[PDB]
Design an enzyme around this catalytic site. Structure first.
Site, PDB file in Angstrom:
ATOM      1  N   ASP A  36       0.808  -1.214   0.000  1.00  0.00           N
ATOM      2  CA  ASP A  36       0.000   0.000   0.000  1.00  0.00           C
ATOM      3  C   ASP A  36       0.845   1.270   0.000  1.00  0.00           C
ATOM      4  O   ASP A  36       1.511   1.588   0.990  1.00  0.00           O
ATOM      5  CB  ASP A  36      -0.938  -0.016   1.208  1.00  0.00           C
ATOM      6  CG  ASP A  36      -1.928   1.136   1.208  1.00  0.00           C
ATOM      7  OD1 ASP A  36      -2.069   1.834   0.179  1.00  0.00           O
ATOM      8  OD2 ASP A  36      -2.575   1.336   2.253  1.00  0.00           O
ATOM      9  N   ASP A 218      -1.685   5.450  -5.655  1.00  0.00           N
ATOM     10  CA  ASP A 218      -2.140   4.573  -4.578  1.00  0.00           C
ATOM     11  C   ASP A 218      -2.422   3.141  -5.028  1.00  0.00           C
ATOM     12  O   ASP A 218      -3.402   2.879  -5.727  1.00  0.00           O
ATOM     13  CB  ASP A 218      -3.378   5.170  -3.896  1.00  0.00           C
ATOM     14  CG  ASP A 218      -3.714   4.486  -2.582  1.00  0.00           C
ATOM     15  OD1 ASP A 218      -2.958   3.587  -2.152  1.00  0.00           O
ATOM     16  OD2 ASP A 218      -4.742   4.853  -1.975  1.00  0.00           O
TER      17      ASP A 218
HETATM   18  C1  LIG Z   1      -8.255  -4.780   0.268  1.00  0.00           C
HETATM   19  O1  LIG Z   1      -8.261  -3.410   0.670  1.00  0.00           O
HETATM   20  C2  LIG Z   1      -7.100  -2.701   0.878  1.00  0.00           C
HETATM   21  C3  LIG Z   1      -5.942  -2.984   0.144  1.00  0.00           C
HETATM   22  C4  LIG Z   1      -4.776  -2.254   0.364  1.00  0.00           C
HETATM   23 CL1  LIG Z   1      -3.290  -2.612  -0.575  1.00  0.00          CL
HETATM   24  C5  LIG Z   1      -4.762  -1.241   1.316  1.00  0.00           C
HETATM   25  C6  LIG Z   1      -5.913  -0.956   2.049  1.00  0.00           C
HETATM   26  C7  LIG Z   1      -5.876   0.160   3.072  1.00  0.00           C
HETATM   27  N1  LIG Z   1      -5.624   1.435   2.407  1.00  0.00           N
HETATM   28  C8  LIG Z   1      -5.300   2.457   3.401  1.00  0.00           C
HETATM   29  C9  LIG Z   1      -4.806   3.680   2.626  1.00  0.00           C
HETATM   30  C10 LIG Z   1      -5.855   4.169   1.627  1.00  0.00           C
HETATM   31  N2  LIG Z   1      -5.314   5.236   0.809  1.00  0.00           N
HETATM   32  C11 LIG Z   1      -5.413   6.525   1.133  1.00  0.00           C
HETATM   33  O2  LIG Z   1      -5.845   6.940   2.200  1.00  0.00           O
HETATM   34  C12 LIG Z   1      -4.937   7.483   0.072  1.00  0.00           C
HETATM   35  O3  LIG Z   1      -5.807   8.611  -0.062  1.00  0.00           O
HETATM   36  C13 LIG Z   1      -7.081   8.542  -0.578  1.00  0.00           C
HETATM   37  C14 LIG Z   1      -7.484   7.479  -1.391  1.00  0.00           C
HETATM   38  C15 LIG Z   1      -8.782   7.429  -1.900  1.00  0.00           C
HETATM   39  C16 LIG Z   1      -9.686   8.451  -1.604  1.00  0.00           C
HETATM   40  S1  LIG Z   1     -11.184   8.426  -2.174  1.00  0.00           S
HETATM   41  N3  LIG Z   1     -12.185   8.116  -0.964  1.00  0.00           N
HETATM   42  O4  LIG Z   1     -11.493   9.709  -2.738  1.00  0.00           O
HETATM   43  O5  LIG Z   1     -11.341   7.413  -3.187  1.00  0.00           O
HETATM   44  C17 LIG Z   1      -9.278   9.512  -0.793  1.00  0.00           C
HETATM   45  C18 LIG Z   1      -7.981   9.559  -0.285  1.00  0.00           C
HETATM   46  C19 LIG Z   1      -7.568  10.717   0.587  1.00  0.00           C
HETATM   47  C20 LIG Z   1      -6.302   3.010   0.740  1.00  0.00           C
HETATM   48  C21 LIG Z   1      -6.778   1.841   1.602  1.00  0.00           C
HETATM   49  C22 LIG Z   1      -7.082  -1.688   1.832  1.00  0.00           C
HETATM   50  O6  LIG Z   1      -8.221  -1.401   2.558  1.00  0.00           O
HETATM   51  C23 LIG Z   1      -8.733  -2.235   3.613  1.00  0.00           C
HETATM   52  C24 LIG Z   1      -7.646  -3.069   4.288  1.00  0.00           C
HETATM   53  C25 LIG Z   1      -9.456  -1.372   4.640  1.00  0.00           C
END
Ligand SMILES: COc1cc(Cl)cc(CN2CCC(NC(=O)COc3ccc(S(N)(=O)=O)cc3C)CC2)c1OC(C)C
Length: 367
Positions: A36, A218
């Protein structure tokens, strides 16, 4: 040159992110860990949650050191206990580092029922690490404690696979040339989108609209996430270019699924999308181009993988799966090149082209 040990070290499932095998503690405790670039914390399952295949057992590690501190991380949540231990990547560099670890003891809607991963590797910068920027992220620790160069690269490919090359570039993982966009600030991997084109036609919008608040790279996000006004103009153009066939309302929203007979998928009716990114030189830019194959995720049935964002442009797995992405942390820049594993038809191909002249690029970013 070539890092054959690290090639094809990523596994996943469509829409569930890419994970890499990691070792924690002494003796080694194997865990699958999400890759991530949108977070900065290294956190793992430490309690026997029903969804977990395995979990980090601190009592079995002689090299575990308690930091006596709690950490909370909410999402659109998990809570853990801070400590340090020996961490290493089996299909990574032959090194071992003492990195910060958040042993997740309590979590709500974090772990996925049926998933094969047990933790998360936050590869972004300290400034967005919880609780504060004083908790060193894994990669920062790796660079300080070893002779691994401050660089990593990701080749994500459309079960799901890919490669994370830690400490270098594998030149077989891309075709053509690498074009670099600068990292604007070291928190998220922030970039600046300076122009968007659909099948050749400019969207004719102010470039500030593309980056409102921030635009990021991301791997933790599945879709290409465009800002409200930018997304609406984009769908309008894709509908116009593909008005040959019928599509329900829920398709463009990302709800419903569109299917064709095995091999009857009309790729030619769908436009290409081109994002122009700020270049390395003053007034110089370059464009990256994605095919329908990238933004139509298979579920032959497909799903519309572009949606609205609460921030600026979020370049998720949709974008990344078409390109070999180099996170050159050493030179504060991100490189893009055509991925050698990207899915393409015979007629069209995904591209990285330049240079272009784009004036007043600095104005596109948010203040
Ligand atoms: C299988 O699922 C996951 C897989 C992976 Cl590899 C990682 C995560 C956890 N990540 C934590 C960081 C997060 N990225 C950010 O915060 C970056 O900033 C944004 C991104 C999108 C929007 S938005 N809402 O506008 O689209 C807005 C912002 C500010 C992505 C998710 C996963 O999620 C589950 C474990 C809860």
């Amino acid at each position: 040159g070539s890092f054959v040990e690290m090639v094809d070290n990523l596994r996943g499932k469509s829409g569930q992110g890419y994970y890499v095998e990691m070792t924690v503690g002494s003796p080694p405790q194997t865990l699958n860990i999400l890759v991530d670039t949108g977070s900065s914390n290294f956190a793992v399952g430490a309690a026997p949650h029903p969804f977990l295949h395995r979990y980090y057992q601190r009592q079995l590690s002689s090299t575990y050191r308690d930091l006596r501190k709690g950490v909370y991380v909410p999402y659109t949540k998990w809570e853990g206990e801070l400590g340090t231990d020996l961490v290493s990547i089996p299909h990574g560099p032959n090194v071992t580092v003492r990195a910060n670890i958040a042993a997740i003891t309590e979590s709500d809607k974090f772990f996925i029922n049926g998933s094969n991963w047990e933790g998360i590797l936050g590869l972004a910068y300290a400034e967005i690490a919880r609780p504060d920027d004083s908790l060193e992220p894994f990669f920062d620790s790796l660079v300080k404690q070893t002779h691994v160069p401050n660089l990593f690269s990701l080749q994500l490919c459309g079960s799901v696979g890919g490669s994370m090359i830690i400490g270098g570039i594998d030149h077989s993982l891309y075709t053509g040339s690498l074009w670099y966009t600068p990292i604007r600030r070291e928190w998220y991997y922030e970039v600046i989108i300076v122009r968007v084109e659909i099948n050749g036609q400019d969207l004719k919008m102010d470039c500030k609209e593309y980056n409102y608040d921030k635009s990021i790279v991301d791997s933790g996000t599945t879709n290409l996430r465009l800002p409200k006004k930018v997304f609406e103009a984009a769908v309008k153009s894709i509908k116009a270019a593909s008005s040959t066939e019928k599509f329900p309302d829920g398709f463009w929203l990302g709800e419903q699924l569109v299917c064709w007979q095995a091999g009857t998928t009309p790729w030619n009716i769908f436009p290409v999308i081109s994002l122009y990114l700020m270049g390395e030189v003053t007034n110089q830019s370059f464009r990256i181009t994605i095919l329908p194959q990238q933004y139509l995720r298979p579920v032959d049935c497909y799903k519309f993988a572009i949606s609205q964002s609460s921030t600026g442009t979020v370049m998720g797995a949709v974008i990344m799966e078409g390109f070999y992405v180099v996170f050159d942390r050493a030179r504060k820049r991100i490189g893009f090149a055509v991925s050698a594993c990207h899915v393409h038809d015979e007629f069209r191909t995904a591209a990285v082209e330049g240079p272009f002249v784009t004036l007043d690029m600095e104005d596109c970013g948010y203040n």
